[PDB]
Amino acid sequence: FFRGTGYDEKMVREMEGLEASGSTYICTLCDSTRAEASQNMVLHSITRSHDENLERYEIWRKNPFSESADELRDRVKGVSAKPFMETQPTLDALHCDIGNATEFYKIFQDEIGEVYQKPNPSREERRRWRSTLDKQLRKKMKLKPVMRMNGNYAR
């Protein structure tokens, strides 16, 4: 029994015929749009499967309903390219960790300053809140920043 699991997002979406990567379809499992993924967050079913992606791609090719670009984009829920390597319906552990880490990194750079109080900040204030966050991580916790946060820095 084989399981294709240990692939980062970009490759997974690239080899399963997705629109890599941050396009209007995000989840490799639930086919809800991006903005919709903000309205509901928890209630979803896992549907994406290899053979059914081949079905949807055959639909994309033949175009048996003569729909336009966007209507066909939706009818297949965004499957452009023909996948060829079958992959298991799962996410990675590591770089979900790194993504949550960099997300909290950004939101910390934000809340050091004011965001609910500042509708649109500028680049200078963003880098400044970064700099005071880095000085804080150095004085306390003894953490100098790095170019990008790996797994250890994330932990």
Binding site: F1, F2, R3, G4, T5, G6, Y7, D8, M11
Partner: protein, 148 residues
């Protein structure tokens, strides 16, 4: 396990054999064929049914991945360098390496050893990823495809 070179090893071995030797480490040549147990392409096996589309020679080791790309520069160029195995040979090597552990576990559970020789199931994880900024010694990239 410690990244030594051939000449490295020969110097070390020759040295420690000179003094108080009583040779201890083994010479290089002997390892040069002693490893052939742990590489692919050593262990007999087969499949029922036979595999589709696979030359059933069970002894080939390292193989260039191009798969006989016709070098015709007329067509798409065959420049990309690669090296790989034949999956089956890799799997039989890894498994027959695990032979020790699987027999041990079979004995620990006190399950019979003569019979029950037909219902083994193996879940194998595969994982692939590229590798960025490989300092080259073709661009600076490379992709490695492994399994576990």
């Amino acid at each position: 396990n410690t990244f030594l070179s051939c000449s490295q090893y020969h110097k070390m071995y020759r040295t420690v054999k000179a003094t108080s030797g009583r040779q201890i480490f083994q010479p290089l040549h002997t390892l040069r064929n002693a490893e052939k147990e742990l590489l692919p392409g050593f262990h007999q096996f087969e499949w029922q049914p036979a595999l589709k589309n696979v030359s059933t020679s069970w002894d080939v080791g390292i193989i260039d991945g191009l798969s006989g790309w016709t070098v015709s520069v007329d067509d798409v160029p065959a420049d990309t360098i690669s090296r790989r195995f034949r999956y089956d040979v890799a799997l039989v090597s890894a498994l027959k390496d695990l032979e020790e552990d699987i027999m041990e576990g079979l004995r620990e559970r006190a399950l019979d050893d003569s019979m029950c020789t037909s219902g083994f199931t193996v879940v194998v994880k595969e994982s692939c990823d590229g590798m960025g900024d490989v300092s080259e010694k073709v661009p600076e990239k490379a992709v490695r495809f492994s399994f576990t």
